Design a protein around this ligand. Structure first.
Ligand SMILES: O=C(C1CC1)N1CCN(c2ccc(F)cc2)CC1
Ligand SMILES: [Cl-]
Ligand SMILES: [Cl-]
Ligand SMILES: [Cl-]
Ligand SMILES: [Cl-]
Ligand SMILES: [Mn+2]
Length: 340
């Protein structure tokens, strides 16, 4: 039977089922006030699916100049055509290769660049913004979005949205690497999975995806969305409460020292965006510092709500197109205030 919502993460994560329900705020707002992330499923069913395909981005924008990142070693691939990224999104034999002859796991950096999404892609901008869940929080002009209403004593987010495009991580060694490393944002954000590409050529890599989800500490209900309903899983997230940020900094200063980094005792390993918490580090965070997180699998059409100040990291299971919008809720405005 169709229900308003369910619980993931053993009761600690709200999952809303109807992305456009006029009464969603009644279920959402107490979870949000307590500083929890929230998941909303079904956004893909509201979108024009033809606007969000990798082949359309290549045909329309392929001659633009961009930089890529090799996710395995952080090497920057400078000044290539954006088609060189898109044409290998799902077809492994078309991907740029490393010196060892293997196909690379690539991230497309800063594309579209800066605040240019709306100017470059007006039809896509309209399709995303008209179908965001919790529209009084998430729309530029929402009644509960303070972004356009605050003075300079507050850090204001850029004009969005922003697109996040990267291949899936593939090997046993890739399990310890991030697509996006551990960091925090001073605004709230909603991140929508608009396309998942499951490749061909090495298309049989479904086994290491199951081991990554399991070792990623995913709950038993999350493990059922695959096996029972064959939804397409895009990315594995870990999110931590804003109140636990300093304890995470203490763990990472101690691990940097153990590994022979030479950092002043005050440097900020979260702002540095240089760490990915693998199974070993997540267990050490729990056991040595008392900190538990939320392990979330973002399927096609899932929207992830990330609270301001909450440290978070992202590991792509398959090739993902994500679109995210920043907003400033009244519940979390303290995180962008410039005093005390
Ligand atoms: O000099 C370099 C690397 C430092 C960037 N490259 C030229 C050769 N490339 C290549 C790899 C596999 C292959 F089948 C053909 C060519 C890899 C990239
Ligand atoms: Cl908070
Ligand atoms: Cl467009
Ligand atoms: Cl709302
Ligand atoms: Cl990163
Ligand atoms: Mn972020």
């Amino acid at each position: 039977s169709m229900t308003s919502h369910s619980w993931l993460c053993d009761g600690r994560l709200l999952c809303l089922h109807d992305p456009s329900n006029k009464n969603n705020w009644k279920i959402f707002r107490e979870c949000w006030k307590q500083g929890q992330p929230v998941l909303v499923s079904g956004v893909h069913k509201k979108l024009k699916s033809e606007l969000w395909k990798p082949e359309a981005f290549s045909q329309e924008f392929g001659d633009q100049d961009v930089d890529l990142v090799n996710c395995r070693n952080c090497a920057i691939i400078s000044d290539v055509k954006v088609r060189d990224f898109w044409d290998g999104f799902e077809i492994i034999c078309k991907r740029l290769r490393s010196e060892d002859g293997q196909p690379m796991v690539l991230k497309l950096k800063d594309w579209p660049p800066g605040e240019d999404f709306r100017d470059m892609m007006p039809t896509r901008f309209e399709d995303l913004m008209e179908n965001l869940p919790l529209p009084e929080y998430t729309k530029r002009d929402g009644r509960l979005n303070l972004a356009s209403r605050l003075p300079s004593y507050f850090v204001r987010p850029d004009l969005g949205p922003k697109m996040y495009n990267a291949y899936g991580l593939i090997t046993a060694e890739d399990r310890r690497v991030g697509t996006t490393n551990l960091h925090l944002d001073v605004s709230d954000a909603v991140n929508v999975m608009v396309y998942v590409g499951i490749p061909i050529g090495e298309g049989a890599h479904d086994e290491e995806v199951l081991k990554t989800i399991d070792e990623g500490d995913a709950d038993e209900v999350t493990k059922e969305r695959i096996h029972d309903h064959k939804e397409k899983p895009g990315a594995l997230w870990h999110i931590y409460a804003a109140k636990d940020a300093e304890k995470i900094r203490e763990l990472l200063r101690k691990v940097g020292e153990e590994q022979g980094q030479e950092n002043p005792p005050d440097h900020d390993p979260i702002h540095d965006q240089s760490w990915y918490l693998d199974q070993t580090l997540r267990k050490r965070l729990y056991e040595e510092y008392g900190v538990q997180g939320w392990a979330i699998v973002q399927f096609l059409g899932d929207a992830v709500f990330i609270p301001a100040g909450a440290p978070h990291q992202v590991h792509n299971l398959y090739s993902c197109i994500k679109v995210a919008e920043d907003f400033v809720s009244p519940e979390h405005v303290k995180h962008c205030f410039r005093l005390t």
